[PDB]
Amino acid sequence: LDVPCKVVITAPEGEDPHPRFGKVEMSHAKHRNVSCVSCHHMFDGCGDFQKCADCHIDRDDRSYERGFYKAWHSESEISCRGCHKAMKAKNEQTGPIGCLQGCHEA
Amino acid sequence: LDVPCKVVITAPEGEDPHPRFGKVEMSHAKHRNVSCVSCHHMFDGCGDFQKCADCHIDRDDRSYERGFYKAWHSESEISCRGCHKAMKAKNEQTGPIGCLQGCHEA
Ligand code: HEC
Ligand code: HEC
Ligand code: HEC
Ligand code: HEC
Ligand code: HEC
Numbered sequence: 504l505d506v507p508c509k510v511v512i513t514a515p516e517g518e519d520p521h522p523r524f525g526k527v528e529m530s531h532a533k534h535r536n537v538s539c540v541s542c543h544h545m546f547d548g549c550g551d552f553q554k555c556a557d558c559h560i561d562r563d564d565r566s567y568e569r570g571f572y573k574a575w576h577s578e579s580e581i582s583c584r585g586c587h588k589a590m591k592a593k594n595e596q597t598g599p600i601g602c603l604q605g606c607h608e609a
Numbered sequence: 610l611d612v613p614c615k616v617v618i619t620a621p622e623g624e625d626p627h628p629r630f631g632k633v634e635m636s637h638a639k640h641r642n643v644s645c646v647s648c649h650h651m652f653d654g655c656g657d658f659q660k661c662a663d664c665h666i667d668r669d670d671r672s673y674e675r676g677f678y679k680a681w682h683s684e685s686e687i688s689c690r691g692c693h694k695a696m697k698a699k700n701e702q703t704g705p706i707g708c709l710q711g712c713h714e715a
């Protein structure tokens with residue numbers, strides 16, 4: 504499909520991930536009310552799509568804004584956890600925040 | 610997915626173009642502040658961004674809401690001319706409205 508309904512997000516090739524943190528499912532359908540650029544923040548209205556880890560490569564420095572970990576966990580509202588925390592602070596229905604809740608579960 | 614930065618819109622596949630109004634270019638780049646669903650009104654969450662004339666096929670009149678002409682020229686703000694006219698009425702920066710301005714121009 505042009506936009507797959509569910510995606511499986513993994514670590515890039517290289518260092519195996521911690522066994523409990525290696526794959527996360529995300530649904531584009533559940534995020535239908537979130538604009539593409541809210542997540543695909545480098546999309547400027549046309550062009551094609553990459554994996555986030557085509558840029559968010561570094562796995563060793565979890566503080567680095569352009570690294571792998573911060574793509575998903577930064578306080579930035581671009582990140583999975585950052586948006587969900589910001590929405591929760593607004594009492595808005597949103598996604599999970601706990602480390603083994605939802606994303607890293609099941 | 611590759612969202613073309615410029616598309617050339619013409620008659621439905623396999624059909625002959627209008628002899629004077631046959632092709633119109635549209636820039637996704639220029640429309641980057643317009644949500645995808647504002648035009649692709651059948652897209653919901655995930656799936657395909659279909660060409661409009663997959664559905665807007667009829668050219669027997671310029672009145673049928675599901676036909677070709679109304680996709681582009683309708684009071685509806687989903688249509689090219691309808692959105693531009695509505696935005697102009699609100700004194701918002703927008704696209705062209707005259708029949709030979711922009712869309713059906715060099
Ligand atoms: C955050 C909630 C997102 C929204 C809103 C949209 N997308 Fe998305 N998309 C997101 C992720 C995290 C992923 C997986 C990327 C990875 O590195 O694993 C995707 C994936 C896609 C893809 C496939 C890219 C690929 O793996 O090659 C496409 C083509 C895509 N997304 C398109 C897209 C569009 C057009 C959106 C708005 C309608 C959109 N996405 C929203 C996260 C999010
Ligand atoms: C390269 C073309 C990139 C792709 C694809 C994705 N990101 Fe990105 N991201 C990139 C850069 C260069 C930067 C720094 C800001 C800038 O534009 O220069 C970022 C930043 C983020 C952030 C902010 C992190 C922080 O400041 O703490 C997040 C949360 C982030 N990126 C997430 C993210 C996701 C989820 C992506 C796939 C959907 C993604 N990025 C793609 C470069 C690139
Ligand atoms: C805001 C800009 C978001 C970003 C970035 C991400 N998510 Fe999200 N998420 C958001 C909303 C508004 C919602 C609620 C949708 C609703 O109306 O119900 C969600 C929800 C989720 C869920 C729960 C879905 C379900 O089945 O109930 C998950 C598991 C989830 N979000 C995951 C997720 C991931 C992995 C993201 C980064 C790739 C991510 N979200 C980004 C808003 C936003
Ligand atoms: C969804 C909103 C998430 C929540 C909540 C948390 N994490 Fe996450 N994490 C998420 C994604 C989309 C990804 C990328 C895909 C993958 O599983 O690798 C990750 C990744 C990690 C990793 C792996 C890092 C690496 O291998 O380099 C770890 C160790 C990790 N996540 C830990 C973690 C912790 C401690 C959390 C609470 C602060 C947490 N995650 C929440 C998405 C989401
Ligand atoms: C109206 C101003 C639009 C906005 C906003 C977006 N798109 Fe669009 N797109 C539009 C048209 C009129 C066309 C040409 C269709 C035709 O019938 O000729 C397109 C085309 C696409 C395509 C390509 C489809 C194909 O050629 O088969 C894609 C993948 C696409 N559009 C995606 C897309 C996305 C993801 C948008 C939001 C970021 C988006 N479009 C906005 C009109 C408009």
Ligand code: HEC
Pocket residue numbers: 648649650651659660661662663664665674675679680681682683684685686687688689
């Ligand atoms: C079939 C899957 C369709 C595609 C692809 C597109 N449109 Fe559509 N359109 C469709 C229907 C069934 C209808 C009627 C209303 C409904 O939702 O049932 C419409 C309507 C419009 C209109 C309104 C016309 C009017 O009432 O005068 C416009 C302006 C319109 N559609 C435009 C449009 C464009 C520009 C598309 C490609 C980007 C497009 N439609 C695709 C069915 C389908």
Ligand code: HEC
Pocket residue numbers: 633634635636639640643647648681686687688689690692693696702703704705711712
């Ligand atoms: C509102 C929901 C729109 C619809 C539907 C379409 N257009 Fe549009 N258009 C819109 C805006 C807000 C703007 C201004 C962008 C800016 O900030 O400058 C425009 C602009 C144009 C232009 C001028 C720019 C250019 O590409 O040369 C053209 C020629 C144009 N729009 C064409 C066009 C066509 C062909 C559409 C239907 C397929 C269409 N627009 C829809 C807002 C909206």
Ligand code: HEC
Pocket residue numbers: 618619620626627630631632633668677678681682689690693704705706707708709710711712713
């Ligand atoms: C962009 C905002 C437009 C303006 C202003 C006008 N038209 Fe248009 N027209 C537009 C598109 C995107 C298309 C589809 C592609 C194509 O060129 O075929 C059209 C099409 C027509 C047609 C052809 C119909 C057919 O069955 O082939 C005609 C005759 C036409 N347009 C006429 C027309 C007139 C009279 C306008 C002023 C009221 C007008 N158009 C404005 C986009 C845009």
